[PDB]
Amino acid sequence: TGGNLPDVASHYPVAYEQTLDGTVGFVIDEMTPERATASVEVTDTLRQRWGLVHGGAYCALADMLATEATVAVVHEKGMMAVGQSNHTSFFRPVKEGHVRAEAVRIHAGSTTWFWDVSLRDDAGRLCAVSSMSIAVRPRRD
Amino acid sequence: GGNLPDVASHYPVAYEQTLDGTVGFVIDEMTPERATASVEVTDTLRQRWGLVHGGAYCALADMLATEATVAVVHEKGMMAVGQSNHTSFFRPVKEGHVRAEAVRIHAGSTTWFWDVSLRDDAGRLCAVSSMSIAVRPRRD
Amino acid sequence: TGGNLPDVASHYPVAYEQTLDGTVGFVIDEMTPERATASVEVTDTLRQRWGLVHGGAYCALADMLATEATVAVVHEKGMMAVGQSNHTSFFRPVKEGHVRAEAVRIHAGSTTWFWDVSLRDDAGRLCAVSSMSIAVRPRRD
Amino acid sequence: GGNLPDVASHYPVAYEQTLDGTVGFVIDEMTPERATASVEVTDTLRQRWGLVHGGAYCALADMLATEATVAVVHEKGMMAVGQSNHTSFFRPVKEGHVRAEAVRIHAGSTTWFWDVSLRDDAGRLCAVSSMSIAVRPRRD
Ligand SMILES: CC(C)(COP(=O)(O)OP(=O)(O)OC[C@H]1O[C@@H](n2cnc3c(N)ncnc32)[C@H](O)[C@@H]1OP(=O)(O)O)[C@@H](O)C(=O)NCCC(=O)NCCS
Ligand SMILES: CC(C)(COP(=O)(O)OP(=O)(O)OC[C@H]1O[C@@H](n2cnc3c(N)ncnc32)[C@H](O)[C@@H]1OP(=O)(O)O)[C@@H](O)C(=O)NCCC(=O)NCCS
Ligand SMILES: CC(C)(COP(=O)(O)OP(=O)(O)OC[C@H]1O[C@@H](n2cnc3c(N)ncnc32)[C@H](O)[C@@H]1OP(=O)(O)O)[C@@H](O)C(=O)NCCC(=O)NCCS
Ligand SMILES: CC(C)(COP(=O)(O)OP(=O)(O)OC[C@H]1O[C@@H](n2cnc3c(N)ncnc32)[C@H](O)[C@@H]1OP(=O)(O)O)[C@@H](O)C(=O)NCCC(=O)NCCS
Numbered sequence: 001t002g003g004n005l006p007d008v009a010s011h012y013p014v015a016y017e018q019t020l021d022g023t024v025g026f027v028i029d030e031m032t033p034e035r036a037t038a039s040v041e042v043t044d045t046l047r048q049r050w051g052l053v054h055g056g057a058y059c060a061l062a063d064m065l066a067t068e069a070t071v072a073v074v075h076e077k078g079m080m081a082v083g084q085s086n087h088t089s090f091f092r093p094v095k096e097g098h099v100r101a102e103a104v105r106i107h108a109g110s111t112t113w114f115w116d117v118s119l120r121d122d123a124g125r126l127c128a129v130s131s132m133s134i135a136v137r138p139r140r141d
Numbered sequence: 142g143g144n145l146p147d148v149a150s151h152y153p154v155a156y157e158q159t160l161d162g163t164v165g166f167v168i169d170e171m172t173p174e175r176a177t178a179s180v181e182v183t184d185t186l187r188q189r190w191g192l193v194h195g196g197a198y199c200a201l202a203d204m205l206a207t208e209a210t211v212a213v214v215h216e217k218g219m220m221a222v223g224q225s226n227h228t229s230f231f232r233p234v235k236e237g238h239v240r241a242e243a244v245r246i247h248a249g250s251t252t253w254f255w256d257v258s259l260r261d262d263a264g265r266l267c268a269v270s271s272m273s274i275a276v277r278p279r280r281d
Numbered sequence: 282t283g284g285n286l287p288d289v290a291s292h293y294p295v296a297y298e299q300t301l302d303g304t305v306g307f308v309i310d311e312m313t314p315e316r317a318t319a320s321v322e323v324t325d326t327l328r329q330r331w332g333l334v335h336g337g338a339y340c341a342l343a344d345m346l347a348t349e350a351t352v353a354v355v356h357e358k359g360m361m362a363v364g365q366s367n368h369t370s371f372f373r374p375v376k377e378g379h380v381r382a383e384a385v386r387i388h389a390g391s392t393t394w395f396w397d398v399s400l401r402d403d404a405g406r407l408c409a410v411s412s413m414s415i416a417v418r419p420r421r422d
Numbered sequence: 423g424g425n426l427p428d429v430a431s432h433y434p435v436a437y438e439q440t441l442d443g444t445v446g447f448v449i450d451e452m453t454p455e456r457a458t459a460s461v462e463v464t465d466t467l468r469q470r471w472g473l474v475h476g477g478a479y480c481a482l483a484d485m486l487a488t489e490a491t492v493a494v495v496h497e498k499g500m501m502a503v504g505q506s507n508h509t510s511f512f513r514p515v516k517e518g519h520v521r522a523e524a525v526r527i528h529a530g531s532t533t534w535f536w537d538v539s540l541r542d543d544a545g546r547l548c549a550v551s552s553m554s555i556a557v558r559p560r561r562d
Contacts, residue, residue, distance in 0.1 A: 044154050055204075060196020064196065082192075091528040129527065300465060304466050329435070336504040342477070
């Protein structure tokens, strides 16, 4: 897919280049049922006015990666998956380079999957983490 | 200039090039205890399934709470930056606007905390964000 | 009930005085479907070794009050309610007196209710807050 | 003395009278990067429905993460205390033990952060706690 999001449907409401993810440049590298990775090159579109990666950008990258890692498994079982909680904590800022995210699945329940997502800079330092709780529900249409 | 608080003569990134400008965040009211902001839904704010992106609610809450703290503390020699953002999602938004209201609930020497509500065009509570804002002396 | 917890069943697995809540002295004052209050007199049983109310005590009081405020409504509809996330943030410590909690319902969905709980000292100051997310599920037995 | 780190000659509250002593928390391993603790389930740890109290997992995570920070920073003149505890609950515990393992993931000048896992007697992950620990100069 665009951004390499999992291809689980024949068509999507919004094309990759037009979504938030498309606009800021998020790209998924690996995806398996228990772990997924994605990254993004830092440009001003990712920053706040003070020149640092925007807090919302780490949240969004985590959210898309954990959500979609769940969608990759559950869609074909007739479920929808959507984030119900995103708790991101910020340890070190990023000014430039890339942000690289790794989502590790820690719980796969029938109604909720939980992913721990680490967000690292190009030196490998842990700049933020997000705890992503993803609701899983039967698709209604 | 998204109407962000004018606290400095120069900013490293212009509004229109920032994430906030790209998606269209605009601050309406700002006081030390309460601030509001809003955005029109466009595809730039959406994920590929046509709903407002989880990260969009987080980014709105984050810029609002953070810059409402900057508004007070910058002229006191302090830098303010988000240290935790906990957003929870109750109802999706497909189109219209998202409107945020940040209510300051704690203002301590090193941390300010804001409860942010994110509502749709019908006034319904779609999400909430608990924003924890670190306050530290500006590094010369 | 003991602690004035909502009386929704003819019998309970564990008596009030023997539970955590019983042991530390939590007591519910008001309960309605949208708001509930409870308090606790501070004694050493509530404190950590450094003499301050234990971080776990604020979490527990919030958790019981939001959970039970949900149970008060949903039990008689055949649902069980149990906390799925408790996010407590700590602003000011308490050394002695009481901790008073007020739970305000902010979302009542079919699977999740969400309560904002403020925890105040005897001077009325806001010492901690907890965001309580309560899963609601049909009872299995 | 729940085996908490011995960093001071006197403590305001004895172990047995603290919340930790009343419910039975005991620290096993403690190093600067990783600590473990456990408790036997008894009714004192339970809510009236017979399951381990939500607050019990939070209190375990909180004392473990906090005191693993005290272990390092106290002798450096610093006080450490929890500023946020985010616990999420995946599976209940009716009886047996709860075992916690705190892994330090960030150690900054003013905040240390610990990922705490809470497991049952079968090793299953029952809950997790993200502990944010504020570190400040001790007030003389
Ligand atoms: C919140 C929760 C109900 C959500 O369910 P989930 O994430 O979809 O997880 P699953 O439904 O896949 O099941 C996990 C376990 O939760 C419990 N559970 C789930 N639904 C339940 C229900 N309707 N009634 C009773 N227990 C239930 C069961 O113990 C289940 O184990 P089992 O499948 O061996 O019976 C579940 O995660 C949970 O019970 N969490 C623990 C809550 C807790 O312990 N809070 C602390 C205070 S008691
Ligand atoms: C986390 C914390 C230290 C961060 O400090 P802050 O947000 O900058 O808050 P302030 O520094 O403005 O001070 C608020 C109160 O915190 C306490 N505090 C702050 N710094 C302190 C320090 N270095 N030593 C002792 N107490 C301190 C004091 O009670 C202070 O009140 P006072 O200034 O009237 O004495 C402070 O919010 C706090 O103590 N939170 C509560 C911690 C808690 O109770 N945890 C649960 C287990 S005890
Ligand atoms: C997570 C969630 C599914 C849990 O459901 P809940 O707390 O039990 O709330 P309810 O089920 O009572 O319903 C609230 C709304 O959620 C949505 N929803 C719930 N279940 C759904 C499902 N199976 N399929 C699609 N939408 C659903 C619907 O919009 C619903 O409104 P409606 O009842 O008018 O259709 C729901 O809160 C939600 O969708 N949250 C918003 C998620 C979100 O917007 N994330 C941001 C990125 S898109
Ligand atoms: C929140 C925060 C300031 C708390 O500080 P802390 O936990 O004590 O961390 P430290 O103070 O040990 O410093 C870690 C990095 O934070 C930044 N920082 C800390 N204090 C700072 C200050 N007063 N001014 C500018 N940067 C500061 C520096 O990048 C520091 O790295 P360095 O010491 O190598 O320059 C720090 O963790 C931080 O900056 N977090 C990331 C904030 C973020 O990116 N938010 C998202 C929107 S920009």
